[PDB]
């Protein structure tokens, strides 16, 4: 077993891997494409002598942190193991050159998202983001007399076929994930193959149609089976009227019983309506996964909430330093330091507090974080708290 | 129509339409044990003349709020329009008038239980905490090195008869109720009756056990469908070894595939696991709704978050008056004002900020509260934001 | 911990163990009868100090081996840990207290129904019978021209309430049990709690029939929440024209769709329609667990084909010595030897053998049966072999 | 109504009788490469007057017997009456005819695979095989200490794309199909046929996989709705060692809760896992269909156990003839007489016999098979037993 970086005659084989391993396999054409996001060095392979039995590789990614600040992130993806080579260790060797060729380039933050909750916890990566599935009975559904756009006169909404308003979609969407924690920027490859999964395909997904205003779009389509579900994939909304008006309109698919979309848990959908029940969560999942590569970089580049004053703490990740983090202002300095540790946690516990989805006090309930001060608490609770609630961009 | 006190004779004719009303409805016997805590004038009936059409009543509670404090709670309940009387303003006639009893009698808050999500928003009263259900795959589980109580030696927990442990259950649902938001003093009667539904019923639910820690106890039973479901009807932890101490014992029933319950978003549990994603969310709903009676009691006798620094605004309730908030040090002082409004919202909005269950932001978002300043939305979530999670008690 | 035989005072505890372990728990009162089958010093405790964390006992039976030998047999039952003392090894240490005193006290072989299918084998039990669930469409099945009693006149089976011919079902089950291996001798207590179990009970089962026939009976019910289906709990039939009869008798339920039991591999019924294939297998799992406590006494005590010619062989057991086995006009001599051994297996497999449930062969293309010589297996796959298919009795 | 061997011209009025006949109707193309094994006068057809109304037909086949013996097999297919023409013995008239050919040409045994149980008994066909379906929850599934191939170093078993291995497979094929009972020459046409089906289809069947050991494969593919079900078509294995590596290697599908496999009941899967209720028997049903054309070719062509000693009786077959039987040393002499039978049962229940699948124990305890002496039945039952258990190769 050799691990070494894949050669132009190993992507078949890597492809065959990919079909057997990912039912959801996005077949080699758009492998193709998504390989154009990987550098040089980006990818591993284990041959068994001879045929590939492993592969690993990750892509240069920008992501939206707290405090509108982006980061260049390195986005794991297309990680297998033959099911002829289990307990043999491929993931751990495949992951420990990735992330050592990770942390050599520069990059301050790795990503994923995972398969399964149990695997990528030992290896530093922490769940950071929250997928909820909200379904809406909208037979039942009627808008709060406060929801914004109850006005009569014209719909600022338009029922359009997605493919021919590319441009607008592009910069509604660039303009979302710059100012959202979890926000990726897209590459033109990524809006080619996503305008090309909008068309029908016999014997499997039906048409997608797009609800366009000038500060939002929602793309849905009628679930495959179920002729009464409509599922958005996507609802990119920069304003709160661009919101209220996109489920205005998604509310009006008279033809429907049900509308679903996966969301995050501070989606203001049910606030809308008059009976808040009918927004109901029916799924919740892990999003995206954080690894923090180099600490003080990532803790001194996202921005911290003002609302809490000055204070100084130490820090220690179990095999990632010690650290002097002095917050204040809604910014962190954070230097090494051999004085006693005040604060400790396992570098995945930094990457679920890093954007925002889970209370330091929460993790500490668990004993995942470890304090003798509930006041050093309360404040690490305040400061890593995202004003802008924390989204998922789209898988990779 | 008439509207009057219910007397000793009604009491068949309300036993009747509650038998007709509530699919649920506890029986005569644990009815007249409730209704020991309703005080003189807390019921009101509507009679056809003659026969009840209607029924309303309030309970005397002990409300605990974010800094422990404990409010006289009036909790309606018994709530019922007659299949024949729908559509005549009987709920809003009994609402009215309770509302008129308990503003007089001095209560700063009602609260209930909402049978449906759409009624209850228009008489001013908001969802102020949230029911999440767990279950967890309790085959796959397995604690993270983390998580507390992982040595050898005796366990601390122990493998009960209920009604054996009533003195233990009681102080420390006692010590549990006064330090968590939601908490609700639960008088002998209601003791009296937990017992009691802990028994079998022939072709009904089946045993319940308890595990009882010193600083903690679990109640479950076997589902009576589902023989490889067992659903904990509460769970009350005083501190966090407790809780991860009757998990390791809920996890060790070998029988079961699953354990669900109902607890709130906040709930550690996932984190004790090495794979988070095993306690699923499988249901989300309201649990506890508040009605604000007297804004300034109710908004003076909360603790609000250390963090944010003193600031002045002013808030107008939409028919509740227009008040000068000053909230500095964990206090806030309210008092009468004829100048500008700088936030606005209905009663119900402010009910569901009251215990920290939801974000001003979130509320925000929905035009469900207006301010033109982003500044004094980003003080309000953080200053009624509680450091406790809030929790639900148990349903009247 | 201390592991010490239960006094009189512990039987509380250990049922309220039990009530929280089964959920096919039999209650106090049918266990007290069971408990006459256990004998003094046929149970452990396991103390936490105080209070029972831990139990198992085994009761006096009669096991029915090929050639119609009835062995005493030790059955394991009532085995529980509290869910409080998970991975103490307080299973192990039960079962190896028991185990010395089931050899120290003469009895030639052990068994038990394992709850799950992982745990005993590692303590020596070998699935040793196979239940085998049958689903008839009774209103497609016709019986063969060649059927036995296809004439006309008298029905020689009767509808009979099972309470009023308890010394005919009895003398049955005495022949049925003695010519068949697996066959369980059944006291008077566990016939009292047979004919107790065949009333109704009030949201619980309905009344149980029987069909009786001089050479054979079958007691069946209608199903509690499948009113088209009839489950069959137990089919006794001494001659092939009682189970015939008794199965023309079962195919007369007009008002079932389906007829259900639990049976062995090897029942005819199939053979008993033009269709065989309306005689579904619904459900397939491992019945009695054997534990040979002493090879030699077991090895003797059955019978063996007689259609194989003498061989000798040495047969090794994991812990459990190496003997000459020599096989020849259906009978065994085995002796102890340091000669090589020929054949090797873990206790377990043995048990597995013992009644004729699993060939040889398929043991040993397990590798949990080793051999060079294939002459070897083919003889021991024959002489092992039961004439009389293995039956199961009845769970314990 | 007239019978006639089918013109070229026919065969689109045929393949349009098989189109609204079998769902699973191969297609015109399929139908014309299975239509290679058909000889010159292997089909009848019966024509309205004119159209198509009913057709039958028989391939040349090869199937392996009890001794490693390959017997020349007339396979029926493609056998189908029209719906307007039921009740009118068209069936019955084209057996008879196949039948004749298939006796006059010198077949000494006819096959097939029954779309229902109740039609091909009085033709005299027998249920010859069993498939058993094992579903694994492969999530639980450990390897016993005792399994094959528990080392560490390089997998036997490769992960490979089924058209680049054709030759390997083909090989593998060739050797099992002449070590086991119940096995079939597979010619190159359905070889042709069987690597078309491999590939993915728009709306159909997911791509298939395939294992691949120097003595066993194994072709799998995902179920087509249920995405965490792999069912493997085909697992072919000459070692036992194949036949683990192959099972780990199938088990090694993380991505999968379940691996379903439609094998045999000796199938020692089971046994390879430390719980062996994992391996669970979710179907069972008839497989090949024999009927037994030239009892006395029949009877002396396979081999028999050589367990048995020497022994002689009289068979009768209800209309076959009536033969004196001598099965010595693993071999038979059937040869007429007009001596008074010992042994009667119909031609079908010779058929069940013959492979070794059914026991002639069990067809007597149903009546099918018929005589005064047991101990000819135990010698019976022993001499037709298979020493390598029966298995299905490919339906027809
Ligand atoms: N989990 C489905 C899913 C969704 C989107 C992208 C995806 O693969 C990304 C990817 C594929 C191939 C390569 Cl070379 C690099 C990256 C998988
Ligand atoms: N929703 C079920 C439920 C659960 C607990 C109590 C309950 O009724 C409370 C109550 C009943 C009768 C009276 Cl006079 C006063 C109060 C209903
Ligand atoms: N698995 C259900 C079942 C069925 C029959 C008997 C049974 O317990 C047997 C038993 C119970 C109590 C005692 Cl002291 C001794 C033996 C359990
Ligand atoms: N039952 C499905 C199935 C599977 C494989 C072959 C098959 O038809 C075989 C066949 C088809 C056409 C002809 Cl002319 C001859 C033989 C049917």
Redesign the interface.
């Known amino acids: ?1 050799t691990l070494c970086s894949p050669t132009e005659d190993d992507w078949p084989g890597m492809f ?2 990919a ?5 959801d396999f996005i077949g080699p054409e758009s492998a193709t494409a998504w390989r154009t996001l990987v550098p040089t060095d980006g990818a591993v392979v284990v041959r ?1 002598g001879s ?1 590939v039995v492993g592969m690993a590789l990750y892509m240069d990614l920008r992501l939206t942190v707290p405090g509108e600040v982006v980061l260049p992130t390195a986005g794991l993806s297309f990680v297998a ?6 307990r043999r260790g491929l993931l751990r060797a495949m992951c420990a050159e990735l992330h050592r060729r990770i942390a050599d380039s520069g990059y301050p933050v790795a990503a994923l998202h995972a ?4 695997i990528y ?1 030992r290896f530093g990566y922490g ?1 950071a983001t929250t997928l909820h599935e909200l379904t809406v009975d909208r037979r ?1 559904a009627r808008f ?1 007399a ?3 756009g109850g006005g009569l006169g014209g719909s600022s909404v338009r029922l359009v076929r997605p493919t021919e308003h590319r441009g607008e979609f592009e910069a509604i969407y660039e303009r979302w994930r710059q100012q959202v924690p979890g926000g990726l920027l897209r590459p033109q490859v990524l809006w080619d193959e996503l305008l090309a999964e909008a068309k029908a ?4 997904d039906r048409e997608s149609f797009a609800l366009l205003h000038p500060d939002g779009y929602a793309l849905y389509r009628v679930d495959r089976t179920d002729l009464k579900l409509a599922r958005v994939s996507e609802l990119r909304a920069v304003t ?1 009227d661009a ?2 008006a996109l489920w205005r309109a998604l509310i009006g698919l008279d033809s429907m019983e049900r509308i679903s979309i996966i969301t995050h ?2 989606d ?1 959908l049910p ?2 309506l ?5 927004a ?2 029916t ?4 999003g995206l996964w954080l690894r923090i590569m180099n600490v003080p970089a990532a803790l001194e580049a996202r921005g911290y ?5 000055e204070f100084s703490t130490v820090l220690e990740v179990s095999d990632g330093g010690r650290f002097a983090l002095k917050i204040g202002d809604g910014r962190a300095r954070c230097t090494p330091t051999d004085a006693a540790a005040e604060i400790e946690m ?1 570098r995945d516990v930094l990457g679920s507090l890093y954007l925002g989805a889970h ?1 330091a ?8 974080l470890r304090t003798k001060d509930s006041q050093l608490l ?2 690490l609770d ?1 400061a890593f ?1 995202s ?1 802008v ?1 924390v989204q998922t961009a789209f898988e990779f």
Request: a negative charge.
């Open positions: 077993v065959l891997l079909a057997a391993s990912f039912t068994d045929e193991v033959a099911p002829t080579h289990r398969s399964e909750g149990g916890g769940p039942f709060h406060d929801a914004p395909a016999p014997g499997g709160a919101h209220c848990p501070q203001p606030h809308l008059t009976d808040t029940r009918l109901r969560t799924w919740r999942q892990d909430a003002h609302e809490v004053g396992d209370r006090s929460t993790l500490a309930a668990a004993n995942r309360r404040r305040a708290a004003d609630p």
